[PDB]
Amino acid sequence: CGLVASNLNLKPGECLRVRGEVAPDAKSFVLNLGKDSNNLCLHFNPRFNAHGDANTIVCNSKDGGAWGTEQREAVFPFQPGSVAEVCITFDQANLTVKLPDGYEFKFPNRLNLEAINYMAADGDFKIKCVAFD
Amino acid sequence: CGLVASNLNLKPGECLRVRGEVAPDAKSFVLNLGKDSNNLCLHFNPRFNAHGDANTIVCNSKDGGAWGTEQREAVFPFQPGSVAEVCITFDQANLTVKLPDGYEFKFPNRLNLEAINYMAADGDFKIKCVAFD
Ligand SMILES: CCCO[C@@H]1O[C@H](CO)[C@@H](O[C@@H]2O[C@H](CO)[C@H](O)[C@H](OCc3cn(CC(=O)c4cccc(O)c4)nn3)[C@H]2O)[C@H](O)[C@H]1NC(C)=O
Ligand SMILES: CCCO[C@@H]1O[C@H](CO)[C@@H](O[C@@H]2O[C@H](CO)[C@H](O)[C@H](OCc3cn(CC(=O)c4cccc(O)c4)nn3)[C@H]2O)[C@H](O)[C@H]1NC(C)=O
């Protein structure tokens, strides 16, 4: 288990930036954002090779412990053995996730949070920097 | 409170860098580092005007919930309403705290910690970036 941060108080429009090292033999990594471990407005899960999936970004939510409906994106701007930065903001409608190689997508905001207060990292990604604009 | 982070996995010799905003009306701010909230190898508390002190850094430890003996530093390179970076490293014997304007001091590692896994901020200091080298 990686870094866990709480009391983030990230408000709408504000940008969370996370930079880390993807392991040379990375299979999967996770960035979870929300209120706490049972309440995630974003589970962000790039799979290099995990759960039968190759080079696929899997996203979901978790509401009161229940996983929501999974969604997949169609670009994979991550390499094993490289540094990667991810930038995330939100409003009441969507989270906007900005990634390397110019790519960006929205994920619906399915929870009712006033602020994002919790972040947790897991898997094959070593956090080097977190910034809270 | 302010930001709380766990699973930091900071090891001897590694540098934890914290940048933030000292409030315009600052009286006091705190960075706590250790194993968890009850086991702090460093309670770092710059006091502009608080708890009987003026322009003094107070340091302490907390061991199993019990506060140690306070140490007061000789330097105070902070001002209200400014940005500040603090860099912390540690080893067997001491924490080394590097402050703005080239100041630094040592505080004994009273718990003999071999890893720092917990950090928390409180008071008139808003964390904007946390980095690991
Ligand atoms: C809809 C049902 C379809 O079948 C599958 O069902 C699976 C089980 O529910 C589903 O996987 C789960 O998807 C969730 C998101 O929708 C989560 O990604 C579930 O994992 C949660 C998790 C695991 N971990 C630890 C981790 O990622 C990790 C831990 C250590 C090392 C490492 O490289 C990674 N953290 N969070 C993950 O197990 C698969 O994504 C899903 N596949 C499809 C195509 O939908
Ligand atoms: C004046 C005669 C009594 O002596 C005092 O006794 C005090 C109580 O023991 C002692 O203070 C405590 O020292 C501890 C370290 O030895 C801690 O600093 C105690 O505070 C814990 C604390 C508080 N906070 C929240 C905080 O920093 C904050 C929160 C909101 C606004 C703000 O400006 C600041 N975080 N941690 C702090 O209350 C003071 O250091 C001590 N002072 C002297 C000069 O001896």
AA identity, residue A2 = G
List C-alpha distances in Å: A43 to A31, A59, B38, B48, B105: 6, 5, 30, 41, 41
Distance CA(B30)–CA(B43), nearest Å, equals 7
Find all residues with CB under 8 Å of A104, minimum gap 6, and list them: A96, A97, A98
Question: By the 8 A CB rule, do A2 and A21 touch?
Answer: no
- What is the Cα–Cα distance from B11 to A94, expressed in whole angstroms? 38
Query: DSSP 3-state assignment of B11?
Result: coil
Residue A83 sits at the chain B interface (C-beta within 8 Å): no
Method: X-ray
The residue of chain A nearest to residue B14, with distances taken between CA atoms, is A128
As a whole number of angstroms, the distance between CA B88 and CA B73 comes to 16
Is residue A67 within 6 Å of ligand 1 at its C-beta? yes
Q: B121 to chain A, minimum CA–CA distance in Å? A: 10
Instruction: Give the residue, by CA position, lying nearest to ligand 1 atom 44.
Output: A53
Nearest to B1 among A7, A128, A133 (CB): A7
Beta strand ranges found along A3-123 (DSSP E)? 4-10, 16-22, 29-36, 39-50, 53-63, 66-67, 71-72, 82-90, 94-98, 104-108, 116-123
* Ligand 1 pocket residue status of A32, Cβ below 6 Å: no
- Give A92 Cα–ligand 2 centroid separation in angstroms: 39
**Cβ B46 vs Cβ B38: under 8 Å:** no
User: In angstroms, what is the resolution?
Assistant: 1.5
Task: Please give the CATH topology (third level) of the domain spanning A1-133.
Answer: Jelly Rolls (2.60.120)
- Judge whether A132 and A19 are in contact, CB under 8 Å: no
Measured between its terminal Cα atoms, the distance across chain B in Å is 26
> Whats the size of chain B, residue-wise?
133
Distances in Å between the Cα of B96 and the Cα atoms of B5, B10, B57, B103, B114 are: 20, 14, 14, 11, 14
B3 contacts on A by Cβ (under 8 Å): 5-8, 132
